[PDB]
């Protein structure tokens, strides 16, 4: 079996919010692939807004289930810090939340206005590469009084506010800085309504708001008050609530998640209050995902797969049942009942399922547990060159910790790069289930102790090459082609001050009177390099090189064009003569007329040797 370990899974989980970091990178990352990225977020608008997590296998930072993602995370800090102290993730939870609670305060400017998105669908996700060198705009776009999103706004309130509770023990200041942007969102949202996808309409196609803005209403109200014990704050959220309608037909058939808080918000209140209406919405929902739900003549219950997971729908069918499987132990924690227990063996089952105990008899969690998925849905893991998702045939970095979409209502699973159903990834995905994994550990965990030194620094493949082969060679010339390649990963890296050099022996020159000076270096077929005349390396041993320079050229691993540039070039001595010997040549080695990397052409960027042997 696989021998299970919550500190080292809570570890992995944070590792992928680490992944997903847009902007400028601190020294002390765990992540040597990820480097600096989207560092121009917002200068289209004269703002700073770099950081925040990238969404999935893409590169938008879409606001809305960004800050559903924090506002759980925090949640869940909330409900069992002890867990998260015990099995040594508390100090990287908090970490990586203000890594998404810091973007939040740069994109909230201004009281009413609140930038929501950076990045366009369209243009981020027709390209298929690192986000280090992506090639495309990224215009931003906000809210603000004149084109509101009340959930947009509600949701980040909710965020700042359960994270102001969760960071006061350590930073105060932080936490009151926190606590006093939620007030003002939550003002901007109670006060303009509308949804924010009215406005942000490129969201429309990838995060539609597709229930409204009454439940994140309630959810930030809610929150505020956590954060600050005030009774108006929960005496807004109860009048929120008049705005859900009759109790008898609140839904319970969907769950908690980025677009509906309802879940969320009911559960809440129905903790503070006791009150009737939320009890009963609370246990319909988790009756219909769990036993089933009684109508009192019939039973209503979810689907489930033959191999027993709770089946939302096509996407994201484990986020669901995560999700579901948090608001159970959170209930669960809470209530006395029967219920308590039926929703607490529901909430272990599922998350043993996505863990390993499924017919697919594999962990869904990449990184992690037996046969994980190789293949995510992840641009930056992935790591290609090509601008093609098929090259690489691997991906070359572990996205340790990311919870897949996974199997379908047959329990049927496709471990695909292409397969979004089966491998997508995303921010929303693993919120939820990391609350859940530090349950997991609260229940299950003793002993259990995380990863030390880890991740290990990836060795990295080679990253800059000229590949090259003979056109020609004479008793008088050698001449060369070459593509100078980037196919950095480790970080993928883009640069504009590629150069290599073409090393030489002259001893033969020189025996027959003849000096580098009777040497002529000319270019011929070029896509933008400078070739110089022969320079030494060793004057004592008559040994000399070109350097061809690509400066001013950007070459980076993203498309087929993209990561290489072709240079031609001939070493000439004078016409007539006949001593030129490129046999004893340092870069002539082991070179045919079939392109092929050497590493006796060494490859510089900036001056800096970055790849291959001088002689
Ligand atoms: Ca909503
Ligand atoms: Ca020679
Ligand atoms: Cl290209
Ligand atoms: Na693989």
Redesign the pocket.
């Known amino acids: 079996e696989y021998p299970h370990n919550y500190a080292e899974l809570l570890q992995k989980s944070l590792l992928f919010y680490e992944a997903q970091r847009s902007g400028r990178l601190p020294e002390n990352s765990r992540l040597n692939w990820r480097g600096d990225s989207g560092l121009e977020d917002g200068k289209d608008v004269g703002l700073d807004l770099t950081g925040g997590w990238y969404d999935a296998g893409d590169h938008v930072k879409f606001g809305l289930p960004m800050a559903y993602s924090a506002a759980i995370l925090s949640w869940s800090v909330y409900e069992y810090r002890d867990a998260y102290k015990e099995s040594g993730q508390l100090d990287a939870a908090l970490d990586n939340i203000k890594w998404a609670t810091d973007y939040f305060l740069k994109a909230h400017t201004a009281p009413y206005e609140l930038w929501g998105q950076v990045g366009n669908g369209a243009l981020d996700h027709a390209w298929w590469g690192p986000a280090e060198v992506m090639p495309m705009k990224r215009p931003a776009y906000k809210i603000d009084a004149g084109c509101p999103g009340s959930d947009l706004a509600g949701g980040t309130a909710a965020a700042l506010a359960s994270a102001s509770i969760i960071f006061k023990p350590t930073d105060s200041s932080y936490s009151e800085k926190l606590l006093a942007h939620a007030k003002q969102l939550y003002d901007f949202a109670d006060r303009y309504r509308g949804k924010y996808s009215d406005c942000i309409t490129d969201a429309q196609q990838y995060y539609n708001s597709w229930s409204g803005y009454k439940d994140e209403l309630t959810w930030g109200a809610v929150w505020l008050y956590l954060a600050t014990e005030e009774q108006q704050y929960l005496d807004k959220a109860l009048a929120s609530v008049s705005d859900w309608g009759d109790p008898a037909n609140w839904p319970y058939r969907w769950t908690l998640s980025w677009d509906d808080v309802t879940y969320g918000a009911q559960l809440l209140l129905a903790r503070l209050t006791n009150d009737s209406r939320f009890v009963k919405s609370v246990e319909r929902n988790l009756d219909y995902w769990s036993t089933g739900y009684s109508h009192n003549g019939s039973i209503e219950r979810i689907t489930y797969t033959p191999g027993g997971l709770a089946w939302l729908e096509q996407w994201g069918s484990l986020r669901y049942a995560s999700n579901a499987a948090f608001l159970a132990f959170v209930y669960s924690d809470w209530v006395d009942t029967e219920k308590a227990k039926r929703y607490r063996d529901f909430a272990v089952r599922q998350t043993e399922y996505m863990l390993g105990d499924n017919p697919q008899q594999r962990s869904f969690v990449v990184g992690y547990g037996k046969n994980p998925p190789?293949?995510p849905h992840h641009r930056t893991a992935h790591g290609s060159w090509a601008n093609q998702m098929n090259v690489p045939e691997?991906?070359r970095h572990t996205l340790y910790g990311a919870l897949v979409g996974g199997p379908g209502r047959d329990d049927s699973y496709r471990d695909d790069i292409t397969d979004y159903a089966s491998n997508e990834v995303a921010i929303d995905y693993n919120a939820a289930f990391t609350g859940n994994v530090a349950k997991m550990f609260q229940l299950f965990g003793k002993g259990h102790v995380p990863l030390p030194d880890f991740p290990e620094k990836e060795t990295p493949e080679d990253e800059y090459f000229a590949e090259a082969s003979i056109n020609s060679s004479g008793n008088s010339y050698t001449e060369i082609r070459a593509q100078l390649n980037n196919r950095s990963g480790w970080p993928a890296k883009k640069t504009d001050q590629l150069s290599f050099r073409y090393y030489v022996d002259l001893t033969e020159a020189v025996e027959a009177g003849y000096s580098a000076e009777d040497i002529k270096v000319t270019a011929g077929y070029n896509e933008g390099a400078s070739v110089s005349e022969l320079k030494p390396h060793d004057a004592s041993k008559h040994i000399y090189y070109t350097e061809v320079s690509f400066s001013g050229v950007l070459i980076y691993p993203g498309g087929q064009s993209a990561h290489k540039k072709e240079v031609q070039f001939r070493l000439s001595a004078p016409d007539g003569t006949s001593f030129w010997n490129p046999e004893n040549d340092h870069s002539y080695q082991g070179l045919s007329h079939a392109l092929l990397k050497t590493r006796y052409i060494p490859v510089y960027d900036d001056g800096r040797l970055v790849f291959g042997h001088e002689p």
Request: hydrophobic share 0%; glycine share 0%.
């Open positions: 190789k293949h691997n991906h």
